Design a protein around this ligand. Structure first.
Ligand SMILES: *CCc1cc(CC*)nc(N(C)CC(=O)OCC)n1
Lengths: 288, 12
């Protein structure tokens, strides 16, 4: 069976929690902690292994941005360090294409990156690829049809409604149609033939709106809004439904987990996280 | 408050 893993996050300080939710029975399991606490990281899976990429440890003793890549194996319940990226990347976005991890954007102190690098698990090596056309932190990343999309974020001065796509065989980024809403800290995922952008912050308020990009029509369309406004949420897809986890709503660190059913265009509350937090990394893999 | 990042909630 497959579980939704949530790694890290923030509540009072950056966290080292690894917890896994089972949609089939509503259970939560607490698994091995990350070796270093981190929030603003991203999670992904390659070959049944869970990876935690980038982030920052915002601790009582200071703020340290992370260039780390760590790998969790559900068969052993152990984390192992991998090669680190070229630079630290807080509020990074990641996508997997053909067994390789692409790390996009993020910040290191006041530096807002446009750089992008790609990890090859078989060689344990990272290499830089073409940078994005825009610097983006708090960027949402998703993969559809072996193309990588970077959506929204913050460029160091303005929050963005823009988005762009990377075409690996041409090592080139191109702008796509911008979203109808400015969003930094949105959750971005893919479902069917669309890229969804949920929540985030528009410069004034945390959002409950959700829009999707149809890659054939090049248009963005709003779908049903989430019940809760949220920014710095985790997101993933499991058995044809989108799950959003936690986040910050300007008042509370949410423990709410909502699930979108695209056939009925409705969101429902399915479980609560064990404690409220923002800036988690999320991905789906086998039970431990 | 404006000591928090409004996107993430983190203390600045
Ligand atoms: C408005 C509540 C709040 C939150 C935080 C966390 C950054 N700080 C503060 N201040 C003003 C006290 C302080 O010393 O902040 C630095 C950690 N208030």
């Amino acid at each position: 069976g497959r579980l939704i893993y949530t790694a890290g996050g923030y509540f009072r300080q950056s966290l080292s929690y690894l917890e896994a939710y089972n949609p089939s029975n509503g259970s939560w399991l607490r698994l091995a902690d990350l070796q270093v606490p981190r929030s603003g990281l991203a999670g992904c899976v390659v070959g049944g292994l869970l990876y935690a990429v980038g982030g920052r440890n915002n601790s009582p003793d200071g703020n340290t941005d992370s260039s780390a890549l760590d790998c969790y194996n559900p068969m052993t319940n152990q984390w192992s360090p991998c090669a680190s990226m070229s630079v630290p990347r807080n509020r990074i976005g990641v996508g997997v294409i053909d067994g390789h991890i692409y790390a996009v954007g993020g910040s290191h102190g006041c530096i807002h990156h446009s750089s992008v690098e790609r990890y090859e698990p078989e060689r344990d090596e990272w290499h830089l690829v073409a940078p994005m056309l825009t610097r983006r932190i708090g960027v949402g990343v998703a993969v559809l049809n072996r193309l990588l999309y970077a959506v929204g974020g913050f460029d160091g001065t303005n929050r963005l409604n823009s988005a762009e796509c990377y075409y690996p065989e041409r090592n080139e980024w191109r702008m796509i149609t911008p979203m109808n809403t400015i969003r930094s800290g949105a959750g971005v995922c893919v479902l069917h033939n669309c890229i969804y952008a949920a929540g985030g912050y528009d410069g004034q308020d945390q959002l409950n709106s959700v829009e999707r990009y149809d890659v054939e029509t090049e248009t963005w369309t709003f779908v049903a809004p989430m019940r809760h406004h949220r920014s710095a949420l985790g997101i993933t897809v499991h058995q044809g439904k989108i799950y959003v986890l936690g986040g910050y709503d300007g008042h509370t660190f949410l423990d709410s987990v909502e699930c979108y059913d695209p056939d009925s265009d409705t969101w429902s509350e399915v479980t609560r996280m064990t404690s409220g937090r923002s800036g988690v990394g999320v991905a789906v893999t086998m039970e431990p | 408050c404006l000591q928090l990042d409004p996107e993430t909630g983190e203390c600045l």
